[PDB]
Amino acid sequence: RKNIFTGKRLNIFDMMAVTKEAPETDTSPSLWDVEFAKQLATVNEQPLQNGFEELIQWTKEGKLWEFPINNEAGFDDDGSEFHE
Amino acid sequence: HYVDWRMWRDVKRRKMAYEYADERLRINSLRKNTILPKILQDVADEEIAALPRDSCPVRIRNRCVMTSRPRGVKRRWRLSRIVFRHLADHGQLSGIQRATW
Amino acid sequence: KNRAARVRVSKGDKPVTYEEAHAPHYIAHRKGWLSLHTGNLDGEDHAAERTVEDVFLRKFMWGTFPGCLADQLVLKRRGNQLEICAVVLRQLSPHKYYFLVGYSETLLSYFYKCPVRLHLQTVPSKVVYKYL
Amino acid sequence: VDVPKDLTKPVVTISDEPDILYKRLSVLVKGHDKAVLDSYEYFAVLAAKELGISIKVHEPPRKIERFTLLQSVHIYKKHRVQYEMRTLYRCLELEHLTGSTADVYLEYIQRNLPEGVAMEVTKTQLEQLPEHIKEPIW
Amino acid sequence: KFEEKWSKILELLRHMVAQKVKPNLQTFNTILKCLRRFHVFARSPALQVLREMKAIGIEPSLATYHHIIRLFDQPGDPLKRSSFIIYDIMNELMGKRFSPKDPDDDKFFQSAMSICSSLRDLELAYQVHGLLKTGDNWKFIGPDQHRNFYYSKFFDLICLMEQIDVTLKWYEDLIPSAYFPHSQTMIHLLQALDVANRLEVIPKIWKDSKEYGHTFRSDLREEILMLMA
Ligand SMILES: [Mg+2]
Ligand SMILES: [Mg+2]
């Protein structure tokens, strides 16, 4: 009648109150970090389950137009103003 | 791999005309007004005349993209009357039917 | 005499499909259009580029599935999507169909820069509307 | 029995920016087939009623463009073939919508636009006078 | 032996603390994965590692529990410890939406269902499946061979331990939409129909068997004929 979570623990690692305050975002990821992030996208990889899911995938990849239709999607003429 | 040598000559003309369009527009504007001095307008007359002949847009011909027929082409589809009818009569052009009224 | 798209009478032994049996004056009366897009509507653009694409696709599918197609293609365009509906025969092995569907959908998507789907419908034999 | 237990609903975040107000939306749909416009109208009107949108439908007059071509490949000028393209219309007039409501309705009905049907959506937006026009500077 | 290996591992953890290096989730998952060779010696130590994770604040992922149940579930008839672990793990994981954290997150559900079949507990199996169906947890089922194993063990336990009327509902929902049955699962379904005295369905099972590629399976053909006669 004893829960597995209650009992003796290894006290080598002290209780970390918080994580690292600032990560090295500017530093580019190494090949190991990139490849490890690709393995975490495979555990969650499943085949498309219906038509809606295929449309959702295409939209995320940029293959399918985003609705409602905007005829100027992806075209901002150099961010120019009307007065220029 | 174009339909014939005639189509190939029109392809080159459309390409050369595209490359020179801005230069031709700029020089032609100098000539198409009464504001600038005639001495300057005469030099512009010579300059636009010295450009390659195949840059002149009037030399482009709207040939059928499928058969190269230079006449009887419908501009909306860029097809000769014969090719258009072949596709239309087989029901392969969306919304085009035989007209009776 | 008119000739356009008229399968002419034989001895009563030539099987024709429903599309091949109807002459051009039936295209909005008894048979529909084999392609549906917006190019040919009033005030719409790019009818020419849609036409060339349709002609290529019908040639591509005829040679990519040699001897399999049982009738003409039905090309559908909705927004950015292109959907090819083909009635094929039940002679080629299913493995070869799946290979060719994956190959044609990928190759055509990269050629015309749009999502392309191929919807196959199999029939035991060519559907005969009448014997001319 | 094999039914999903819980469902992740898509996150809709209420912003702190005010919404757009559309006085009218004019959804003009063009097609070559009248029955396809009939079905689309029924769908569009039902969707509007279920979402609480005021909708009125009318049918603008059809446009028939006709043109003539030669019958034979060579000579025989007197003999022609005449083709036409029929453009039929249906106009859905929505009223008193907000930017969010219009965005949802338009995405829903535009995604379900049947092959061979085009749409032109005219949006009338209600705006207030520019700040610079409240009084003259001179 | 384990004791020496355990001392070595603990020494590295002490080196990690000395160098001011904070352990990540993978640090503990590798320990548990490594502790699987020592079948019965690492059970209590492995639980200590899990208890340490929760205290530090590292949240066990699906991979963490996968390694634990694999360690605790070795070929033993009692499965007394395994019984307690799985029940406690399922209570903790109830109604938890998971996100990919470790490459082995996809191996949990197949291992959880395999233990439910060994314990022959249908209520536990329904809890495991319940977890799979909440939110987007269904995407952790894994590759095809994982998905087939999970559903084979799950449907075989339903046929054995549940009323025939509910078994047939699970049969219709799962096959063919979720998986294609193995010839042995059709035999289990035929045996369940026999126990329930519902032999009017045997002709339908034969039709379905032929549609699922078991027309020429000798074992299946002999079972159907014997039951009918
Ligand atoms: Mg000319
Ligand atoms: Mg005549």
Swiss-Prot record, chain A:
It is found in: Mitochondrion. It comes from the Eukaryota. Component of the mitochondrial small ribosomal subunit (mt-SSU). Mature mammalian 55S mitochondrial ribosomes consist of a small (28S) and a large (39S) subunit. The 28S small subunit contains a 12S ribosomal RNA (12S mt-rRNA) and 30 different proteins. The 39S large subunit contains a 16S rRNA (16S mt-rRNA), a copy of mitochondrial valine transfer RNA (mt-tRNA(Val)), which plays an integral structural role, and 52 different proteins. Belongs to the mitochondrion-specific ribosomal protein mS31 family. This is Small ribosomal subunit protein mS31. The gene is MRPS31.
From Swiss-Prot, chain B:
Its main location: mitochondrion. Keywords: Disease variant, Mitochondrion, Primary mitochondrial disease, Ribonucleoprotein, Ribosomal protein. GO terms for molecular function: RNA binding; structural constituent of ribosome. GO terms for biological process: mitochondrial translation; translation. GO terms for cellular component: mitochondrial inner membrane; mitochondrial ribosome; mitochondrial small ribosomal subunit; mitochondrion; nuclear membrane. It is found in: Mitochondrion. It comes from the Eukaryota. The keyword Hydrolase does not apply. Belongs to the universal ribosomal protein uS14 family. It is linked to Combined oxidative phosphorylation deficiency 38: An autosomal recessive disorder due to mitochondrial dysfunction and characterized by perinatal hypertrophic cardiomyopathy, growth retardation, muscle hypotonia, elevated lactate, dysmorphy and intellectual disability. Component of the mitochondrial small ribosomal subunit (mt-SSU). Mature mammalian 55S mitochondrial ribosomes consist of a small (28S) and a large (39S) subunit. The 28S small subunit contains a 12S ribosomal RNA (12S mt-rRNA) and 30 different proteins. The 39S large subunit contains a 16S rRNA (16S mt-rRNA), a copy of mitochondrial valine transfer RNA (mt-tRNA(Val)), which plays an integral structural role, and 52 different proteins. Interacts with LIAT1. This is Small ribosomal subunit protein uS14m.
From Swiss-Prot, chain C:
Belongs to the universal ribosomal protein uS3 family. Component of the mitochondrial small ribosomal subunit (mt-SSU). Mature mammalian 55S mitochondrial ribosomes consist of a small (28S) and a large (39S) subunit. The 28S small subunit contains a 12S ribosomal RNA (12S mt-rRNA) and 30 different proteins. The 39S large subunit contains a 16S rRNA (16S mt-rRNA), a copy of mitochondrial valine transfer RNA (mt-tRNA(Val)), which plays an integral structural role, and 52 different proteins. One of its GO terms (biological process) is mitochondrial translation. It is found in: Mitochondrion. The gene is MRPS24. The chain holds residues 36 to 167 of 167 of the full protein. This is Small ribosomal subunit protein uS3m. One of its GO terms (cellular component) is mitochondrion. Keywords: Mitochondrion, Ribonucleoprotein, Ribosomal protein, Transit peptide. GO terms for molecular function: RNA binding; structural constituent of ribosome. Coiled coil: none annotated.
From Swiss-Prot, chain E:
PPR repeats lie at residues 24-60, 61-102, 105-139, 147-181, 182-216. It comes from the Eukaryota. Abundant in testes, skeletal muscle and heart tissue. It is found in: Mitochondrion. Mitochondrial RNA-binding protein that has a role in mitochondrial translation. Belongs to the mitochondrion-specific ribosomal protein mS39 family. It is linked to Combined oxidative phosphorylation deficiency 51: An autosomal recessive, mitochondrial disorder characterized by intrauterine growth retardation, low birth weight, poor overall growth, progressive limb rigidity, delayed psychomotor development, hearing loss, and optic atrophy. Brain imaging shows abnormal bilateral signs at the basal ganglia and brainstem. Patient cells show decreased mitochondrial complex I and IV levels and activities, and generalized mitochondrial translation defects. This is Small ribosomal subunit protein mS39. The lineage of its organism: Eukaryota, Metazoa, Chordata, Craniata, Vertebrata. The chain holds residues 308 to 536 of 689 of the full protein.
